[PDB]
Each structure stands twice: as C-alpha cells, then as structure tokens.
Amino acid sequence: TNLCPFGEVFNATTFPSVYAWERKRISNCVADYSVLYNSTSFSTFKCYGVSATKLNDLCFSNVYADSFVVKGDDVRQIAPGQTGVIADYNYKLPDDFLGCVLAWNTNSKDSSTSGNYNYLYRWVRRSKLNPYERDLSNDIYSPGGQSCSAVGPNCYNPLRPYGFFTTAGVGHQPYRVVVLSFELLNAPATVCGPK
C-alpha cells in the first residue's frame, strides 16, 4: 500500500542544475528497490557500502534522494574520494558514503540543436563544500576579500553554463543523476523493503 515514491524522483519532468541540486527526504513507506536494479537503462549504477541486490531485505530510518544534471564526463566526480569542479564546488559525497549513484543519458530531453544553456555549475568558491553542503549564492567572487560591484578582473562570475548540443560527444552530453543516501539511526525503521 505504502509504495515509496521513487517514480516521482526518477521520472520527474525537470531536473535542477548541479549547483542548485534538490533533495527529497523519503520515509515512512515500503520500498521496492527492484524497480531500480531490474532496469537496463542506467549508464551509471554504483552502490557503496551496500549491494543493490540485497536492498529489498533492509530497513532504514531515512532515505534521501538528491538530483541534478551534469555533463557525461562529470559523472565520475559523484563518488566518495573524488575531486574536481563538481565535487569541490557543487555537490560532495562524504568519505563514508552509504548509498547508490544512478545516472542516465538525457541527450533526447536536455540537449538542443542550438544549445541548451539552462544547466549551471559553480567553478570557484572560498572553500570546498563539505559533504551534502549547498551554495545557492549569486555573488561576485573576489580572491582577496574586496567588494566587487561588477564582474571584472579580480571580480569573478562564479557560475558557468553547460552547453548541451545534440551532436556532441557522449562525455559532453547531459546526464540526470539521482543519489540515494541511506540512514538507519537509533531511530525506528520507517522505510523497508517488501521482504
């Protein structure tokens, strides 16, 4: 009865930019992860600290789902330990990450002949993001600490768009990513598999 709403995470119409990634807390339902691992349409399917295969036998406190778009060559940065512009400045998995990383090609939805520029990423910041931190700001970044009123030299626009073209190479093509994070605190189990 209490079928967990993974279909509205995965089959949602629009995904957000990676700098402005979006979280759905999922609790207090019954889960069927076999909807995920039966399918062959994922290009990335990696689970850390837990097999996908055994997920229907476990019970968890909170399951979080995090979603965003990256270009194809950036999907590798959504893994524990990795660095680069996406891990450093947009979305960061912790070292002791428990969960899955799920990605599929969306060149049919999210590219264009002229170029899709709707998906942004941050490329500079004062520090690296902590695990699961988020930076939504629209400021001018000064390397020293000065006030900047216009984007100039030593006064940086910190955001840049991906440009998604339909004819591009597969590493420059858009990919929707869903990151499933699993907790089971001293809290009672709210999410369970069918078994």
Epitope: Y37, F42, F45, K46, C47, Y48, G49, V50, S51, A52, T53, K54, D73, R76, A79, P80, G81, D95, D96, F97
Partner: antibody, heavy 130, light 111 residues
C-alpha cells in the same frame, strides 16, 4: 585533498626486515570505502604491486611476495605499515604507498574492490646492502 | 596469472595523435578494469586513466582510454601531442590472483 607520506629506513642489511610506514592526511585510514596499498619500483624497472588492506584487516597480496609480506593498519596514528622480511638486493626499490579507488557494488551485485590506484605518495628509496 | 605487454618506446610529432597499446596474454581484457599511470623522470606515478576510460580531474581532455576486445588490448590515446607529455606510461589490471602491470612505454615527442 588527500596526501600520503612514506617514511622508511633508507638502508637495510640483507636477510633483515624492511619496515615502512605511510602517514595519511586529509582523510582517515579508518574509512572502509577504500583500500590502501604499496607499490615498488626497482631502479631502471617498472612497477610491481605488493599488498593492499582496508580498515577491517582484509588483505590482498602479490602471491610471489606473500610469504615475506606483512601489512597492517594503525587507526590510532592515521597510518598503515609494510614489513618485508629477509630482504636481498632484489628488494632495492622506491616504495610507494597509495589509496585505491573506492569499493562499490554494481546493479548485478558484483563487488569491485582494490582494482587500481588513485592517490599516490611521493616514494621512499630503499637500498639493500652490506 | 596473465601478463600485459606494452611497446618499449613510442615516438610521435607534436600535434599528432599517438596510441600506446597494452595486450593481455590470457583471459579477456574486458573482464577487469584497466588503469593507466604516467611517470615523469624523478616523480611518483600519476593516474591518468581508470576504469578503462575515466579521466581524473587535472588530466587533460586530450588523454583518452579505450578497450578493443578483438585484439584483447587496451589503449591510451593522447591527441594534440605536446612536449609536456613525454613520460613513461604503465598500464595495469588484475584478476582474482594478483594485480598485473605493463612493463612501461617510454613516450618520445619528436621534432
């Protein structure tokens, strides 16, 4: 940003035990998503893998070195260590410590683990001589 | 316990594209992940390709990896070859028994 620093004896007499320590910073040796290993390079030659370990104590060895190799982790000092017993001149090499790419399961349930090196240390030169 | 074979050296002009191949002696090259390591003189090795074709951050977009099962081989490919790419390149894989390294390819930029 992870860094790895080898420290070792520099000179070691033949038949004795070579003892090396890698000191982790920017991360914890306790992190059970990763393995941590030792690679060596004799002067003039390429690379040979020695052993790898994770926080539990689970260990993989090069089968030709295994009877002479001991590898351990020390979570209390953020270190892991290698001992290579009964050295000869064929163990003269630069020794590198390293962290692997993280272990993970695929959709079918296969466990990928300890398959390749991601962050390398700077190397420590070991000479075996009388 | 298989071996992996690399050319001892490789020579190409700047701007051209060069490919170091790594041929697995027994088993299938596609059964296990292939890594590529670059080593300059005097330096520790650096990983430039992992999982056959994944490129860590800081390695140029010109470096690319690929697998060819009809010749049972893997390939590092450097496009737009630069003076700065002169180094030794080692491939590496593994089975259930051990990791296996290539013997290394000395890459020389000509002209």
């Amino acid at each position: 940003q992870l860094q790895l620093q080898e420290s070792g004896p520099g000179l070691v007499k033949p038949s004795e035990t070579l003892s090396l320590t890698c000191t982790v910073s920017g991360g914890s040796i306790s992190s059970s998503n990763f393995y941590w290993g030792w690679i060596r390079q004799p002067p003039g030659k390429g690379l040979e893998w020695i052993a790898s370990i994770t926080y539990s104590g689970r260990t993989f060895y090069n089968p030709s070195l295994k009877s002479r190799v001991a590898i351990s982790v020390d979570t209390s000092k953020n270190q892991f260590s290698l001992k290579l017993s009964s050295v000869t001149a064929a163990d003269t090499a630069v020794y590198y410590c390293a962290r692997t790419f993280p272990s993970y399961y695929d959709r079918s349930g296969y466990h990928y683990l300890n398959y390749g090196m991601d962050v390398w240390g700077q190397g420590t030169t070991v000479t075996v001589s009388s | 316990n298989f071996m992996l074979t690399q050319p001892h050296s490789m020579s190409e002009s700047p701007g051209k594209t060069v490919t170091i191949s790594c041929t697995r002696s027994s088993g299938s090259i596609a059964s296990n992940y292939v890594q590529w390591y670059q080593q300059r003189p005097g330096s520790s090795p650096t990983t430039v390709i992992y999982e056959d074709n994944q490129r860590p951050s800081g390695v140029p977009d010109r470096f690319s990896g690929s697998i060819d099962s009809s010749s049972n081989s893997a390939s590092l490919t450097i496009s737009g070859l630069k003076t700065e790419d002169e180094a030794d390149y080692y491939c590496q894989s593994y089975d259930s028994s051990s990791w296996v390294f290539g013997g290394g390819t000395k890459l020389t930029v000509l002209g």
